[PDB]
Design an enzyme around this catalytic site. Structure first.
Site, PDB file in Angstrom:
ATOM      1  N   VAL B  90       6.336 -18.873 -14.018  1.00  0.00           N
ATOM      2  CA  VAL B  90       7.566 -18.262 -13.526  1.00  0.00           C
ATOM      3  C   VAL B  90       8.765 -18.849 -14.240  1.00  0.00           C
ATOM      4  CG1 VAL B  90       8.891 -17.650 -11.477  1.00  0.00           C
ATOM      5  CG2 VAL B  90       6.528 -18.354 -11.257  1.00  0.00           C
ATOM      6  N   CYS B  91       9.738 -18.003 -14.566  1.00  0.00           N
ATOM      7  CA  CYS B  91      10.981 -18.462 -15.187  1.00  0.00           C
ATOM      8  C   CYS B  91      12.106 -18.379 -14.172  1.00  0.00           C
ATOM      9  CB  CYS B  91      11.317 -17.608 -16.424  1.00  0.00           C
ATOM     10  SG  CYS B  91      12.859 -18.051 -17.308  1.00  0.00           S
TER      11      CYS B  91
END
Lengths: 74, 155
Positions: B90-91
Site C-alpha cells: 500500500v502507498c
C-alpha cells in the site's frame, strides 16, 4: 469462577457487554445477545473473532476468547 | 524491548476495542506463541461504496526499529486500486518514514487510514497504472472492476 465478560459489537446495534458463563455454547451466547438487544434469533447470525467464525456448537471455554475480548456480531 | 512491548500493548488494546468488521492478529511464531512482528489483518469495504461486501486481507510486517520505523503493509493477494503497487504494498502517507509516519501512529489508525483510501484514491501518487488510468479515464469500468473484486473477497 463461572463468568467471562465479552464486548459484542455490531453494525447496527449499540455495544453490548455481557458476562456469560464459560460453559455456554457460542449459540447460547448469540441467543442471549438477541434477547438482550431485543432482536429475533436466527441460525444465520454468526460471531467473528480474529477473522474466524466461531463455531456455534463450541463452548465458550473451548475458544480462544479472553476476558474483555470483543466479538463482532454479524 | 520497546518494539515487542509496544506491539503487545497494541494487541491488548485492539482485541478489546476495534472497528466493526476489521480484524488483526499476530501470526503464530515457530515455537509457537505469537510472532508480534508479523500480523494478518482484514479491512472491510465501507457500506454504500463499490467496496462493500469485501473483506480485504493484508499482512503487516514490523521492522526491528518499530515504532521508529513504520510497518510494511501488503494486500494479499494484490489489490486493484490506484495506490496499491503490483506487489500488494500500500502507498500511504502515514506509512512513509519521510512523510507521515510517527511513532504515535497506531495499528487502528493505519487500518482506518487504508480503509479510507480504498474509495478515495490519491490521484497524485499512482502506484499502479491499470487502476490509475481506468480511475481517471473510465470511471464506470473502474467501479465495475471494484465491485467484482469485492465479490471475490466476500468473508
Amino acid at each position: 469462577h463461572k463468568l467471562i465478560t465479552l464486548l459484542l459489537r455490531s453494525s447496527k446495534s449499540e455495544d453490548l457487554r455481557l458476562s456469560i458463563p464459560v460453559d455456554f455454547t457460542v449459540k447460547d451466547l448469540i441467543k442471549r445477545y438477541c434477547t438482550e438487544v431485543k432482536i429475533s434469533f436466527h441460525e444465520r447470525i454468526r460471531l467473528e473473532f480474529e477473522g474466524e467464525w466461531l463455531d456455534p456448537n463450541d463452548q465458550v471455554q473451548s475458544t480462544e476468547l479472553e476476558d474483555e475480548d470483543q466479538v463482532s456480531v454479524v | 524491548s520497546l518494539c515487542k512491548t509496544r506491539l503487545q500493548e497494541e494487541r491488548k488494546q485492539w482485541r478489546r476495542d476495534h472497528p466493526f468488521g476489521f480484524y488483526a492478529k499476530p501470526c503464530k511464531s515457530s515455537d509457537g506463541g505469537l510472532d508480534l512482528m508479523n500480523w494478518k489483518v482484514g479491512i472491510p469495504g465501507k457500506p454504500k461504496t463499490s467496496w462493500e461486501g469485501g473483506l480485504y486481507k493484508l499482512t503487516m510486517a514490523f521492522p526491528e526499529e518499530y515504532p521508529t520505523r513504520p510497518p510494511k503493509c501488503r494486500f494479499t493477494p494484490p489489490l486493484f486500486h490506484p495506490n496499491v503497487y503490483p506487489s500488494g504494498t500500500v502507498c500511504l502517507s502515514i506509512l512513509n518514514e519521510e512523510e507521515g509516519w510517527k511513532p504515535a501512529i497506531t495499528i487502528k489508525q493505519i487500518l482506518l487510514g487504508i480503509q479510507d483510501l480504498l474509495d478515495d484514491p490519491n490521484i497524485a501518487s499512482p502506484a499502479q497504472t491499470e487502476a490509475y488510468t481506468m480511475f481517471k479515464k473510465d470511471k464506470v469500468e473502474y467501479e465495475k472492476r471494484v465491485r467484482a473484486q469485492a465479490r471475490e473477497n466476500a468473508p
